[PDB]
Design a protein around this ligand. Structure first.
Ligand SMILES: C[C@@H]1CCCN1CCOc1ccc([C@@H]2c3ccc(O)cc3CC[C@@H]2c2ccccc2)cc1
Ligand SMILES: C[C@@H]1CCCN1CCOc1ccc([C@@H]2c3ccc(O)cc3CC[C@@H]2c2ccccc2)cc1
Lengths: 231, 228
């Protein structure tokens, strides 16, 4: 796991990818928040499956897996959405049957921020292999500064998370080296990619403000993560 | 000529631009309590020096005043926060708001303690990484340039965004150069670059939480007056 090569890391992440789900409406019939909520809830189940396949994640305690997904889940939905939307300028591909433009989004604020991210991804010509690295970084990084714990186990947990994050950095650099970029270009693109994650955090916080405005997730996460081996 | 700077010239430029460390203004001969009031007054005085600082970050005054305002509107609380975390770095468990205002997390209990704890953790993480002064000024400049650059489509705006990203690239070059100079291997350089940049997502998170607090009880006009 920390023993994986760059190519094995990339292969593992690509293999872990969740499916693209559909909105649940009658397409024969003639609302929006309900559709998005239902989609997101279904997507969360698959997200837990994906998370367990990110190298290193199931090495963590269940408490820490819950903490990381509780921190990162909306970021992860958002980056998935932005990736799906990357070749549909001005629109957001929530699902193959739910492609919305900004007028249909009317918070249109969240909507515009997501569109700009998709644009930035298009500008950078983000690759699939880069995307899955970034999404795994979100999963490992977003909650790693907010463990409210300094037990010896917590120190070990945090060290492991940072070692896995380091392996993903190595993997990104390797992908860029393989694509012919100079060392200078390599560190510049690495930086460009990681700085977008700040914007994605911003978007998640804005979205969370919207959802909390609608009146514990940790219990659901724990239920889905704390699986038995009876299958 | 900002894009023509060497890494060493970029670093000297940034170190030279650093704002002063301000004091809280209260009567120290008087009994202690007024916390938000003290922190607000401090933050407001610190904002004026921030504008001065930003105009000295290579490349920033090449931008339109509209875009300078937009970048500082996005980033100002992040910038106050990374400043605080930096001067708190050698004070485990406390936050050095000012040399005469050093607070532990219990004193922050007077929705604040949540923000206090996140800031303390960032100071811890800086301690663990042994963040250097030259790295810190690079990171703070990156916040200034990056935080608002996804939320500005005119020809001018395309040109502005390209310039911002080119300056950000030069600061990335500069970080890597600092790390190479400190004797780190190429692998260690890229790993440390990534570790430093990923802390910026947490600082963004902290800013949004803090903004929720401040709005709970327009700035661009004040920024414009100060920048113009
Ligand atoms: C999944 C969450 C966790 C438990 C309860 N459930 C509440 C609903 O959460 C959401 C999350 C995202 C959305 C929208 C969405 C849907 C699917 C997806 O792949 C991407 C996104 C991105 C954000 C979007 C949204 C978020 C907040 C406010 C409006 C829209 C809507 C509701
Ligand atoms: C400066 C701004 C812009 C216009 C009005 N003015 C109000 C913002 O006020 C604050 C008040 C407190 C802070 C606290 C602080 C003070 C000084 C400084 O160097 C660092 C910080 C870190 C954040 C901190 C804060 C922010 C929100 C809630 C509680 C504490 C930051 C900004």
């Amino acid at each position: 796991a920390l023993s994986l090569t760059a190519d094995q890391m990339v292969s593992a992440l690509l293999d872990a990818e969740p499916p693209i789900l559909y909105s649940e409406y009658d397409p024969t019939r003639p609302s929006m928040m309900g559709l998005l909520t239902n989609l997101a809830d279904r997507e969360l189940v698959h997200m837990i499956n994906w998370a367990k396949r990110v190298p290193g994640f199931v090495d963590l305690t269940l408490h820490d897996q819950v903490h990381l997904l509780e921190s990162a889940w909306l970021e992860i939905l958002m980056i998935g959405l932005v990736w799906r939307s990357m070749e549909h300028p001005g629109k957001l591909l929530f699902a193959p049957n739910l492609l919305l433009d900004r007028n249909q989004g009317k918070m249109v604020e969240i909507f515009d921020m997501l569109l700009a991210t998709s644009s930035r991804f298009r500008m950078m010509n983000l690759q699939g292999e880069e995307f899955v690295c970034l999404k795994s970084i979100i999963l490992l990084n977003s909650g790693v500064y907010t463990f409210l714990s300094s037990t010896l186990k917590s120190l070990e947990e945090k060290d492991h998370i940072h070692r896995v994050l380091d392996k993903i950095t190595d993997t990104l650099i390797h992908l860029m080296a393989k694509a012919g970029l100079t060392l200078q270009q390599q560190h510049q693109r690495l930086a460009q990619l990681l700085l977008i994650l700040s914007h994605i955090r911003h978007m998640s916080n804005k979205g969370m403000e919207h959802l909390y405005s609608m009146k514990p997730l940790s219990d659901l996460l724990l239920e889905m993560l704390d699986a038995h081996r009876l299958h």
